């Protein structure tokens, strides 16, 4: 069916499919009666009441058949849903089937566009793809090699045992002198052990060499990259890759090391049983045992990371910003994962531990954690499980009696206790910002935005003393992101450009450079400004904004640019640059016996809370040159009819 065909597209189209189904015509129906629907001549019914009415009841009857199909399967849910869908459909169109037909028609019709527009497979006729592939190889290698060694150690151990047994046998029985020259039958046996031992030692070394080398990539590339993405991701960037891939690489090399350790033990047990001047096991004994633990210790300390940065469940929109007295959560996790580690790692949270500013910086506020300070890392069934501790129940508290842009950090300590084995693990979250009142979130978020967009390290906490600058090519992206995360759409080239200039003047360059002072520093700043627009958009213009029926960012300069020489009615929707509250306004052109340009005093939520913007756009009215009221709003930008465009949004 056309329905099926759609569910077979890239998540970018099926996402638009989503935005075609609301409670008016429940998608539940569009799917459970897709073959019936796709069949009917909706275009016709959209024009003839009787056909429409006939089909409306047919549609209802088709629902009844579907209800009974579910009754058989006892699918209590769908029975209930179908039931509701029918009841809805019913009292929404049983008096106007012509419109329900028009709905189904355009809905199916708009689906095709998407399948037609989804054939961009023409524009489809290795970066990380290859990288990821190599690591799997080295890692796999390390693995295999360990097993190979473990296999010769066993062959090594056996020979020695026979060998021993054979010697003992001779020197334990009842011209014999010349026959005692059989000592060579031993001399031979020895040259074997020596050679086999030297061999094992070689491989164990080679193995270490490799391992370390492969461990460098894993910890110095993969780990670092993932950490950086986690940052952007927390800042509104693309979804961060889960750990599973790392968690696997780490966990594998880890097992290998752990085994080499066992191998080293096995080797000494063979030394006890037998040694000699220049025995390799004895010579390498130490170096090896040490190289191994060295690698293994580094490995497992690198694996202890913050999987979910500090976040307040109440303001999930702003991760790294913590409000005093409000509860928050963080989640730690060890990328290694060995059963021999379950419940053996008690993790403790420390706020601002090892911080200079606690003394260095003057006034530097100081807070104290209040909830549960310690948690033990458990396993939790993912598709691969994972070894991690999570902290719900954390509260920050002010211990009292630059401005609020001071950074603090959360510390996580734990330790591995085993036989004559003890490793201390510690790691910290990205810098945090503590605030007292909600009003600071925007500002606070600004800091986090700056910090994470520029720094790569997890600690400095003094970043805002010499705030770097930002390459517009970079600030611009981060900004789009701020939108493409509160709404279904980000900022575009045109919108970005206006913003570019309002920061870099006219000579806007991808390599421009914006000081942090020209971002969150006679009326309020940029970020605070951009922020309050997102506020407005969110609580008063989402659909209009999402559907792209808002230009939002044009300079009054480029404003007329497009508005000059254009359909008299034509108007434009933009956000005010003036208001320190966030407001939109419109501008349009008129002919008055060149073009005349007009714009309304920006509308703020103060208004929009009383009358919908679309409604305002609808009933607006001004004095025409003929001293007779009428509203100049005729065409949206590319010549769309006022009603044509904002039609669905109209209150009534």
């Amino acid at each position: 069916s056309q329905w099926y065909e759609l569910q077979q597209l890239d998540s970018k189209f099926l996402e638009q499919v989503h935005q075609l189904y609301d409670d008016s015509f429940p998608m539940e129906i569009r799917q459970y009666l897709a073959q019936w629907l796709e069949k009917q001549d909706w275009e016709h019914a959209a024009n003839d009441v009787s056909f429409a009415t006939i089909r409306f009841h047919d549609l209802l009857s088709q629902l009844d058949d579907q209800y009974s199909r579910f009754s058989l399967e006892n699918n209590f849910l769908l029975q209930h849903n179908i039931r509701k869908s029918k009841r809805n459909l019913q009292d929404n169109f049983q008096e106007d089937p012509i419109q329900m037909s028009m709905i189904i028609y355009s809905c199916l019709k708009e689906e095709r566009k998407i399948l037609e527009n989804a054939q961009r497979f023409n524009q489809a006729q290795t970066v990380m793809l290859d990288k990821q592939k190599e690591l799997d190889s080295k890692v796999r290698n390390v693995k295999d090699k360990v097993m190979c060694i473990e296999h010769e150690i066993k062959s090594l151990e056996d020979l020695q045992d026979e060998y021993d047994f054979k010697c003992k046998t001779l020197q334990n029985r009842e011209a014999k002198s010349d026959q005692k020259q059989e000592q060579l039958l031993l001399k031979k046996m020895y040259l074997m052990l020596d050679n086999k031992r030297k061999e094992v030692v070689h491989k164990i070394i080679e193995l270490l060499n490799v391992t370390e080398l492969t461990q460098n990539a894993l910890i110095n590339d993969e780990l670092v990259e993932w950490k950086r993405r986690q940052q952007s991701a927390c800042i509104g960037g693309p979804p961060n890759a889960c750990l599973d891939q790392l968690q696997n690489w780490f966990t594998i090399v880890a097992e290998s090391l752990q085994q080499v350790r066992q191998q080293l033990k096995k080797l000494e047990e063979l030394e006890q049983k037998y040694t000699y001047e220049h025995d390799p096991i004895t010579k390498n004994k130490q170096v090896l045992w040490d190289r191994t633990f060295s690698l293994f210790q580094q490995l497992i300390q690198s694996s202890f990371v913050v999987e979910r940065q500090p976040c307040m469940p109440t303001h999930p929109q702003r991760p790294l910003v913590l409000k005093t007295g409000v509860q928050f959560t963080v989640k730690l996790r060890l990328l290694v994962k060995l059963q021999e580690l379950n419940y053996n790692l008690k993790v403790k949270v420390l706020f601002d531990k090892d911080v200079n500013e606690r003394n260095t910086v003057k006034g530097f506020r100081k807070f104290n954690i209040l909830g549960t300070h310690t948690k033990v890392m458990n396993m939790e069934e993912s598709t691969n499980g994972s070894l991690a501790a999570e902290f719900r129940h954390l509260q920050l508290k002010e211990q009292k009696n630059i401005v609020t842009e001071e950074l603090h950090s959360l510390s996580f300590e734990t330790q591995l206790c085993q036989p004559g084995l003890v490793i201390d693990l510690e790691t910290t979250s990205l810098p945090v910002v503590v605030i007292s009142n909600v009003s600071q979130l925007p500002s606070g978020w600004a800091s986090i935005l700056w910090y994470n967009m520029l720094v790569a390290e997890p600690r400095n906490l003094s970043f805002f003393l010499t705030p770097p600058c930002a390459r517009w090519a970079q600030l611009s992206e981060v900004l789009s992101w701020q939108f493409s995360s509160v709404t279904k759409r980000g900022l575009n080239v045109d919108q970005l450009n206006m913003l570019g200039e309002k920061l870099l003047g006219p000579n806007a360059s991808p390599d421009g450079l914006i000081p942090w002072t020209r971002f969150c520093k006679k009326n309020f700043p940029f970020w605070l400004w951009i922020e309050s627009i997102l506020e407005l958009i969110k609580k008063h213009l989402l659909p209009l904004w999402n559907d792209g029926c808002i230009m939002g960012f044009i300079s009054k300069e480029r404003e007329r640019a497009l508005l000059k020489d254009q359909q008299p009615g034509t108007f434009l929707l933009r956000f005010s640059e003036s208001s320190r509250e966030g407001a939109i306004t419109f501008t349009w052109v008129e002919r008055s016996q060149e073009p005349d340009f007009h714009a309304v005093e920006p509308y703020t939520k103060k208004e929009l809370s009383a009358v919908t913007f679309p409604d305002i756009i609808r009933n607006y009215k001004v004095m025409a040159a003929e001293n007779i009221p009428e509203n100049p709003l005729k065409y949206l930008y590319p010549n769309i009819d006022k009603d044509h465009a904002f039609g669905k949004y109209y209150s009534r």
């Binding site: 306004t585 714009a599 309304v600 001004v622």
Partner: peptide, 5 residues
Amino acid sequence: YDKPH
């Protein structure tokens, strides 16, 4: 801003 609400 030349025109009123």
